[PDB]
Amino acid sequence: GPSFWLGNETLKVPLALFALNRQRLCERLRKNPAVQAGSIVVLQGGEETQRYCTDTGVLFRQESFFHWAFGVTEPGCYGVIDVDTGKSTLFVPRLPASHATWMGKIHSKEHFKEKYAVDDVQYVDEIASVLTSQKPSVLLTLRGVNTDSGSVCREASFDGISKFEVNNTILHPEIVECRVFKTDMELEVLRYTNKISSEAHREVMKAVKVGMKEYELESLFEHYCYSRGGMRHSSYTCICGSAPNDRTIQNGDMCLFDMGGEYYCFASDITCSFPANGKFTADQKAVYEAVLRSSRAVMGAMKPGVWWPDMHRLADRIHLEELAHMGILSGSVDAMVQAHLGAVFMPHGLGHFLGIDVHDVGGYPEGVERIDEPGLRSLRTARHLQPGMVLTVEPGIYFIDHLLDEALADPARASFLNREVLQRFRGFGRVRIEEDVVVTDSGIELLTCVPRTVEEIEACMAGCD
Amino acid sequence: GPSFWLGNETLKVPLALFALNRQRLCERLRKNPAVQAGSIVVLQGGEETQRYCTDTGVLFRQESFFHWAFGVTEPGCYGVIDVDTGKSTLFVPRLPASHATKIHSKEHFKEKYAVDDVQYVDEIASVLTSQKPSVLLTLRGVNTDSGSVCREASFDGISKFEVNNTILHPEIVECRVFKTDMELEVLRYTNKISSEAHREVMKAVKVGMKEYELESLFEHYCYSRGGMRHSSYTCICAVLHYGHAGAPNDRTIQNGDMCLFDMGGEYYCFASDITCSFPANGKFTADQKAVYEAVLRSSRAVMGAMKPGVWWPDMHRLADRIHLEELAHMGILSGSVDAMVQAHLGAVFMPHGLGHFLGIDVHDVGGYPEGVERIDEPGLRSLRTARHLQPGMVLTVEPGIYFIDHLLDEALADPARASFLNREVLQRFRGFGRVRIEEDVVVTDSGIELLTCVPRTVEEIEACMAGCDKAFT
Ligand code: PRO
Ligand code: PRO
Ligand SMILES: [Mn+2]
Ligand SMILES: [Mn+2]
């Protein structure tokens, strides 16, 4: 069948991927006791937007649920799926003559059917008539709460939808659950996005020179991903530690570069930390290797059945052990964990689902509660791991004055801290190591492939090989 | 005073630039007979947005009127200007501690932006109440390129004030139409970097490359060497294969192609908009040279004719006449050029407007103020302004010749036009492609200043693509 492709060495993505997703969604809905026979899923795609009141276009990126279901790149579309049969219909805008003049040929419905391998194509202004003729029991529309943004998903609407029975509660948890588990075809794309972003991270490490501006490396990263990967979008706003990051990379700095390209709306999210000048100091090596250790410990321990908060607390324990070894901390690490001391140095969650969104959906379905403790409350899922899930593993150690100050004021934590040693690490900066992995039947598969050991990084930055 | 700067070789932009804009706006409003004493301008800055319902951030770019007045890069702000004194107050978000996981003081923002006062956003009603203004002047009006209505500032409690939303928009638009010398320094810089990027594209292009490889290179040059985080507009190198101009242009560049790259970077929310046309393989064919030099001729004729008092639609018509003359000299057209012009035949080859205001927006504001009417003729109806030129305006000059099948076929089906076309010669230019030459210029007291600096003659272009140092001529 047909595929998405940007030529050269970019990945060919079969439109069969989205067909499989639709089938999987229907299979799930059919098992839902509340789903009436003759139901039709109705999804509305994204539309082109402009900057404020200007005619300056904003780069269009498809809505994620709609992309997952259809892979459609064009703005202004809808898509529906007959639950009982799986039949898919794409609705495309009916375009005017001036479109031929100003922005190219006007394609038939037949063109779109062939391109997207859907069962039928119609125009958007006919959607009420087409759905009416098919006489559905109910329309299943998308409405739910994203547990990372707090935003409510926007339900599809069209002229005449008021004439239909609409249910907006059933679909969201079911399509979210499908997205949580990646198909082999989806994993191929996420392997590819990780490949290109990994390569771009290597180029950044080779290119960094003291005196450069961070945004120069952000630029290089995006250029590598676009020109070699066909990755037009960054998955997220690029974080370039050491809205352009115009900090000058200084001798002695620890760099932290958190960046990931997106291919055909499939994300990647990778973080590398390394010394700006290519040589770890003793202190930098100590902190860096602590995070390397927790990174590897978590990846190693991950398998179906593991509770993700246990992995977070595993990383905490290891960080505290290493910080104690360094002399920053003293006393019982058991006692330290009881006092939540780990969250002083790692305030964010250990890692998150990744897929079509960087912070992918489904981390907190009904029945899965957020843990109200420091560190853990910032976890973007408290689920147990299962095969097919894609996660970031991103422990880090940070020296954040206001977290440190709070701990030093609190007698339950202040005891553990050696102020004379900690003083040396004020303004140390921060280390984060972020890998993308997939859960397998027995463990994980690592998607990311960048230099990680002190030896590998120093050799890479020195221009070796 | 303070300046915006991204280090290295990037331009230092004094925050005085925005203080001068605030001053000019107040001076205009003071002379406006309908403005009450004690009036206060209230502008609302943009807020951060996310992709749909996700927490994926969209890169924040300040709203243009708010930028023009304040130069503030942070989301979530408001800005107020007391008309009678010119006193400026920035309102900034009160950030929680979790943001530290550094938070700047109000004093830090006051120093950074060289405003008279800074307050937190949640205090705006209290602060304005205490200042006892007569009326709040807010922004509402119609953008004549998008058709959209400018968003009027609002805050909890604004209902307790008298609000006028009609005075400000035409006045602040008119201020934006006329660029200050400080604004011109930024536009010179954006044009310099974008011109250099266009040269790098011409130097790098190889048969067999995808167009988006060149778009990527352009963006990388502008960002890494110019600090231009944003393209000014969606960069044109596909709408066809993926539905939006923003999608990657994934056509493979072929031998014999004519390339058209329309791209321009933005620095600190000041735009550029440049188009270069050139042969993919670095050598103009006789036909390519002919079409190209026709557009070069119209480009230069217009630039040579522009000065204060010139009616912009007359420049569009002048380009039309030159295109038709040259197309006739090529044997694509035959007959009376005067007759062709009467038949609006120029619009067959150049369906768009000759050029447009440029500033903080690529298609900048103020092209159609009250009393200035859109001309309902082919080509001219697409002009983004029908104003007379005055010193301080910044315009693009972007004539082009296109061979667009359905426009040509329509002309061939029209008895009023069909005779002018020689199919025997025209047939050879089907699939020729497109030439557009787009310069950015400033209207001076007596003519123009050219901001753009790219190779333009056939020899200059061929030299650039052959890797000659820019100094070579
Ligand atoms: O948002 C998150 O969960 C991770 C940790 C900080 C950067 N990204
Ligand atoms: O929109 C405009 O005015 C011009 C026409 C060609 C592309 N940009
Ligand atoms: Mn990250
Ligand atoms: Mn992440």
Ligand SMILES: [Mn+2]
């Ligand atoms: Mn242009």
Ligand SMILES: [Mn+2]
């Ligand atoms: Mn233009």
Ligand SMILES: [O-]
């Ligand atoms: O991350």
Ligand SMILES: [O-]
């Ligand atoms: O343009």
